[PDB]
């Protein structure tokens, strides 16, 4: 599915933006500077967001304030930031980049920041300005405060949609190529300083989002953010200092009808999410398990498992049609079924409807079955229309004796795993890699094979307590220039050993394939050992790395989940 529309929150009114569109603040086309907000205000790129939720996150800083959420039609001069950076990482690793300024180590610290701290921005950036014929609508967003008695608030996207009569449905779509300075040796300039907007909760924003109302003389006084910080690249922290103010909170929900109150519970041992009825005000008893809601819209279980993984609320389909059931799975940054929205439902702003991004535009909420026995209850996602008469909506209750106000804002992420769902394809058949180093004939399941954005390691989750890392063995002393790869237990935080480090390449590949498949080449950081699979013979499906470019009867196109390099 192509990107047709993007989003951008602005202090300016449709009045202006509807006719002027969005003007660049400069002439410079330097990617790293745009990303890192280096000497801010000079850039030829305008930053947009693949989702409204992402676009307005900066506006939710803790300081009614109001601004305008614009819906923009995307075309061939809109480029995804994350995918653009991954392609440059590939070029640097393959050593085909000439460095006008700075070096590769520094560029990689920037790519790191892009992949982690800034990634939730779901940024699409325009090469040059956005015509008013591009802008299509606008909404009225304001920020109201959560249950009055640092003050926590929520953004609201208000009715009604205001249309731009200068817009023209041109049936275009965002550019699915990564951005390059000289489009058709690539030359790169890497800055030495970064700027970061601290939009509360440890969250970092680039100025190209947090300062939508920029113009030279102090301009920073018009940045919606707790503060702006400056760093040398080597000094750019993962979190903003506001991360230190994070409160822990259990989650309480209340039936719309019955008025019964529940405490969210989750069990990392079997991945169950369930509900347990509680007397409000009266605490203690059942263990108050802790959840947070992060900038990837995930609702995560508080701590990591023995294997250093994170678990998030996941909306699973069932054996029963339009029925969704909440379970835990491994926090993944691109898992749409892990993404939730919260929107207040009462004037007092104490009740929040939780809806799944998985049902896109169909309004939906959380439900339980008001007739179920036992003491623990399943949790469902249902559309708000014709919901079965025996279920009722559960909404998050944020009052004195329930959920803390901090929950209903999006805080910084504790983990940055992409579900890459690696596998391979042979004439209509799908293969999944096994821990043994072999393959098995079946499409790789969701939520099993990951790429850790912090470290560039790839891992295979056997279960919440057992994680294995892909490990290269080949070197210049290996006769024949190939050797098997293997899966090894390893520390999730270990960041020095290059044999555990992998990256993805587009190279010459047709993307997507004639048959719709997302293929990538995969190589090791250490010495560019390429990852491959033997297609047949007595060792069919054996995974290995090689230096040998020209081979027979092996597959070098690896299936990687669509979007893995966009989130």
Curated annotation (Swiss-Prot):
Induction: In strain S1 (grown in vitro in SP-4 broth), low expression, higher expression in the presence of mammalian cells. In vitro expressed at low levels in early- and mid-log phase, transcription decreases about 130-fold by stationary phase. In vitro protein levels peak between 24-48 hours then decrease by 60 hours, remaining constant until at least 144 hours (at protein level).
Domain of life: Bacteria
GO biological process: symbiont-mediated activation of host inflammasome-mediated signal transduction; symbiont-mediated perturbation of host vacuole organization
SUPFAM superfamilies: ADP-ribosylation (SSF56399)
GO CC annotations on file: attachment organelle; cell projection; cell surface; cytoplasm; extracellular region; host cell cytosol; host cell endoplasmic reticulum; plasma membrane
Disulfide bond positions: 211-223
Family from the record: Belongs to the bacterial exotoxin subunit A family.
This protein's name: ADP-ribosylating toxin CARDS
Taxonomy of the source species: Bacteria, Bacillati, Mycoplasmatota, Mycoplasmoidales, Mycoplasmoidaceae
Encoding gene per record: cards
């Amino acid at each position: 599915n192509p990107v047709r529309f993007v989003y951008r929150v602005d202090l300016r009114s449709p009045e202006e933006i509807f006719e002027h569109g969005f003007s660049t603040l400069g002439d410079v086309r330097n990617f790293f500077e745009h990303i890192l907000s280096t000497n801010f205000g000079r850039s030829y790129f305008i930053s947009t967001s693949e989702t409204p939720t992402a676009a307005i996150r900066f506006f939710g800083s803790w300081l009614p304030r109001r601004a305008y959420l614009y819906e923009i039609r995307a075309d061939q001069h809109f480029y995804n930031a994350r995918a653009t950076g991954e392609n440059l990482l590939d070029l640097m690793r393959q050593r085909q980049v000439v460095f006008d300024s700075g070096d590769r180590e520094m560029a990689q610290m920037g790519i790191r920041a892009l992949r982690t701290s800034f990634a939730y921005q779901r940024e699409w950036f325009t090469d040059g300005p956005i015509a008013a014929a591009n802008v299509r609508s606008a909404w009225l967003v304001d920020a109201v405060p959560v249950e009055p008695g640092r003050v926590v608030e929520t953004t609201r996207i208000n009715e009604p949609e205001m249309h731009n009569p200068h817009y023209q449905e041109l049936q275009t779509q965002a550019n699915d190529q990564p951005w390059l300075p000289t489009p058709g040796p690539v030359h790169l300039s890497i800055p030495q300083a970064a700027s970061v907007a601290d939009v509360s909760e440890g969250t970092s924003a680039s100025l190209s989002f947090a300062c939508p109302d920029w113009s030279p003389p102090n301009p920073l006084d018009k940045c919606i953010a707790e503060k702006i910080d400056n760093y040398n690249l080597q000094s750019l922290p993962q979190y903003a200092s506001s991360v230190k103010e994070l409160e822990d909170t259990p989650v309480y929900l209340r039936g719309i009808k019955t008025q019964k109150t529940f405490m969210l519970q989750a069990d990392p041992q079997n991945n169950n999410v369930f509900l347990v009825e509680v007397n409000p005000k009266q605490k203690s008893s059942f263990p108050q398990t802790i959840f947070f809601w992060d900038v990837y819209q995930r609702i995560c279980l508080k701590d990591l498992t023995g294997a250093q993984i994170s678990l998030s609320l996941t909306a699973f389909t069932t054996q029963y049609a339009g029925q969704l059931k909440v379970h835990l799975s491994v926090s993944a940054v691109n898992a749409v079924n892990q993404k939730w929205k919260m929107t207040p439902q009462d004037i007092a702003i104490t009740q929040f409807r939780v809806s799944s991004e998985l049902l896109g535009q169909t309004e939906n909420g959380l439900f339980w079955n008001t007739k179920s026995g036992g003491s623990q209850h399943d949790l469902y996602v249902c559309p708000l229309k014709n919901p079965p008469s025996d279920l009722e909506e559960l909404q998050i209750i944020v009052d004195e004796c329930t959920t803390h106000a901090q929950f209903v804002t999006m805080r910084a992420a504790s983990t940055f795993f992409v579900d890459v769902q690696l596998g391979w394809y042979w004439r209509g058949y799908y293969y999944t890699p096994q821990l043994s180093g072999w393959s098995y004939q079946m499409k790789t399941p969701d939520g099993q094979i990951f790429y850790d954005l912090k470290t560039s390691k790839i891992f295979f989750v056997q279960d919440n307590q057992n994680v294995f890392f892909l490990h290269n063995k080949l070197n210049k002393q290996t006769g024949y220039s190939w050797d098997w790869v293997e899966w090894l237990k390893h520390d999730m935080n270990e960041d020095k050993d290059e044999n555990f480090k992998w990256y993805f390449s587009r190279d010459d590949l047709t993307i997507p394939s004639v048959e719709g498949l997302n293929f990538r080449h995969i190589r090791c950081y250490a010495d560019n050992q390429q990852l491959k699979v033997i297609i047949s013979g007595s060792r069919w499906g054996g995974w290995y790395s090689t230096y040998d470019k020209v081979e027979s009867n092996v597959e070098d196109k690896i299936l990687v989940k669509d979007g893995f390099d966009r989130f």
